[PDB]
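Work package 3, deliverable 3.1, input record:
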Amino acid sequence: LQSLQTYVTQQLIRAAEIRASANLAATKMSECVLGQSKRVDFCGKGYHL
Amino acid sequence: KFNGLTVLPPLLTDEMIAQYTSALLAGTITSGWTFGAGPALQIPFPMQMAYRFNGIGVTQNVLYENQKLIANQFNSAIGKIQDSLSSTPSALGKLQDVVNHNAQALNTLVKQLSSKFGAISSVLNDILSRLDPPEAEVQIDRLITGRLQSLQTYVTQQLIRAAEIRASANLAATKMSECVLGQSKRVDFCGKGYHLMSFPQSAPHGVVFLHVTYVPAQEKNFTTAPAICHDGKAHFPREGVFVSNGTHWFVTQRNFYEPQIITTDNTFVSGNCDVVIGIVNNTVYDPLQPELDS
Amino acid sequence: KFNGLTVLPPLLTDEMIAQYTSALLAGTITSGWTFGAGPALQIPFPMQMAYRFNGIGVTQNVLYENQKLIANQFNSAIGKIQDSLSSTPSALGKLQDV
Amino acid sequence: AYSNNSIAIPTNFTISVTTEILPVSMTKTSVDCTMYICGDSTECSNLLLQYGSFCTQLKRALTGIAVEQDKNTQEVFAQVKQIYKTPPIKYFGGFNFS
Amino acid sequence: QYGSFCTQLKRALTGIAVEQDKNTQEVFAQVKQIYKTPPIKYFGGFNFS
Amino acid sequence: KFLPFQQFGRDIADTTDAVRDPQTLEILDITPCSFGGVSVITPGTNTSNQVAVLYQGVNCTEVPVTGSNVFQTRAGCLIGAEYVNNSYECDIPIGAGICASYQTQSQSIIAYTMSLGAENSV
Ligand SMILES: *[C@@H]1O[C@H](CO)[C@@H](O)[C@H](O)[C@H]1NC(C)=O
Ligand SMILES: *[C@@H]1O[C@H](CO)[C@@H](O)[C@H](O)[C@H]1NC(C)=O
Ligand SMILES: *[C@@H]1O[C@H](CO)[C@@H](O)[C@H](O)[C@H]1NC(C)=O
Ligand SMILES: *[C@@H]1O[C@H](CO)[C@@H](O)[C@H](O)[C@H]1NC(C)=O
Ligand SMILES: *[C@@H]1O[C@H](CO)[C@@H](O)[C@H](O)[C@H]1NC(C)=O
Ligand SMILES: *[C@@H]1O[C@H](CO)[C@@H](O)[C@H](O)[C@H]1NC(C)=O
Ligand SMILES: *[C@@H]1O[C@H](CO)[C@@H](O)[C@H](O)[C@H]1NC(C)=O
Ligand SMILES: *[C@@H]1O[C@H](CO)[C@@H](O)[C@H](O)[C@H]1NC(C)=O
Ligand SMILES: *[C@@H]1O[C@H](CO)[C@@H](O)[C@H](O)[C@H]1NC(C)=O
């Protein structure tokens, strides 16, 4: 039971990290694909087209 | 009041949160985005809306000419917000999710007090009375380590849930700064459409942003060209796009159809008519000649 | 499935994900940024590139007088992406780590 | 309808008002480790004293969460230095706001 | 007799599993219609093949 | 109103809430004995040794007994600080909109409702 509880806790921490990454990917889809961005280095190095 | 668990009151009362939200609304309505960067400078509200229309690439004469229609559309949309929230039973489901996870954690913690934890009984008085000191001591230690582990689990889950709430509150503060205190050019930040304004409203343990956006509505097909050839020179629109309704060529603004005569005022010249791929032949009016000759 | 551990399939299949990304590309190529804010409004692709050039502070004639050069540079860069992904160990390292 | 010289331009517009709902804080809770585990059983208290300093660091963790909740609220809502009031005459060009 | 350890473990893993589908939904299901590219693939000399 | 055969009530979390007195059959609510944390409110020891005490979530008709000032806030009972009717920026947050601070009164610990800022009509 303790080992299973630790597995679930690690999964929760890892899922929080994946959720931050997926929120960033959703922001990049909205702002780099569905628009043109002025934020420096948010899309790439240079002036985003 | 149950088993050493307590709920602390928040520092800011709901009346104070509502006072904050009222100050934010008053600042936005009476001064625009100026109160967020310095002193609040007053401006008539239609002029503020004209600035917002400029910010999304639409000329302000469009606002001033469609003022009553824009006001009516806004009023209808706000009424519909009220109606939509009166209905659709789960629209505030994120706030409810936060509350429910909090309550489930506490009730699970309380119900873990009754579990025997591998011991003879869950009551300390019973284990104390019904056994000799050493054996009862071992049984009570089993209970103690069980309860301590349960409490440690609860605290760790609360840490993880608070990290998620902090991410959400950081996003909400960014949206208050960038959607309410300004006009955002970021896409789909501040709602779908071209952002014009946002209004905050306080909710139990949360915030609600009403995002007012501009949505283009009734499209027409036109023929277009990159440049126009006149006197062997190529002309490009200073701001706008060359369009044709079939016979005549106009220059319009890219987000609203408002055709105008191609003039040296609304175009600029660069190079000759040889390099641009798709340049069409038309005349560019010069205001100076007829008003000089007459 | 081994010892009471099971793996649940994702709701969207990889073909569905491919369909969404294909729709996003079709919208960008045929309409620009207009489909992300409302109805999709067609625009010729060089004119959309001219709008993007105005976006970064360059004028339109810089696009239209170098259109062939810009298109060649883009084509070469895309081919380089293809190659650079074919041969680099742990280019897709983040997904592998996940 | 992508073609190589056709454009679509909107002739009207609509004003949308949409809603976004964001959580800001959660409930601040505290726990008496002793009163939870033991409940006025002095034998339990004496035994519990020999598990180290678990109690103090659970206390510290929960206090950190509780302070963070108030910080969350402050950094979302206290973004105005001054408390602004709307004028008594509520005419704003035909926009209602009521 | 260990209590509700294994109802909350299952609930936590179910929350993670629902969150994964939400992640994919917010990144990819942004576009409302399925746009198609024209049969004639001329885009001014830019090659998207 | 217990059914005639029912002896003790019980709550959502299965905690005994009421009982039936066996000798005479009436229903008695059981309420947990009052508890809570105790917070000490201080200005730095670099300014004063004065102290106020807050019994959190406790009505203080049950507090057994700083200063003789005794005030009932929605956070609990505050002892050793006097509630004034002014409002200032929050110095030490007590809760429910109540803050405390060290002020000339000569010096003492006061409690007040925090001000959110200065009014301003544009
Ligand atoms: C433009 O023409 C296409 C056909 O080529 C048609 O499908 C489309 O609906 C037209 N657009 C408008 C706004 O009428
Ligand atoms: C195009 O617009 C002009 C306005 O100058 C109008 O006179 C003409 O009839 C229009 N042509 C077509 C084909 O609609
Ligand atoms: C435009 O006019 C010039 C001179 O009048 C001529 O050489 C050229 O062929 C014309 N272009 C078209 C597309 O008719
Ligand atoms: C548009 O013009 C180009 C010539 O530059 C041609 O290759 C392409 O097929 C044309 N497209 C259509 C739909 O006529
Ligand atoms: C724009 O749409 C409104 C409805 O929202 C309509 O009443 C109005 O006539 C339209 N404007 C034009 C120029 O067609
Ligand atoms: C604002 O809307 C309300 C409906 O909620 C309406 O009763 C009121 O008359 C409107 N304000 C004005 C100035 O018409
Ligand atoms: C696009 O590039 C591919 C190579 O990646 C090439 O085979 C193809 O011919 C190109 N398309 C056109 C229309 O030239
Ligand atoms: C117990 O005896 C007392 C005698 O005064 C009486 O008042 C009470 O009703 C009795 N209770 C029961 C349950 O018989
Ligand atoms: C204790 O204080 C509370 C205020 O929090 C009040 O409602 C309650 O009536 C008080 N109890 C008594 C016995 O005065």
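The interface with chain D takes residues 37-38, 42, 44 of chain E (CB under 8 Å).
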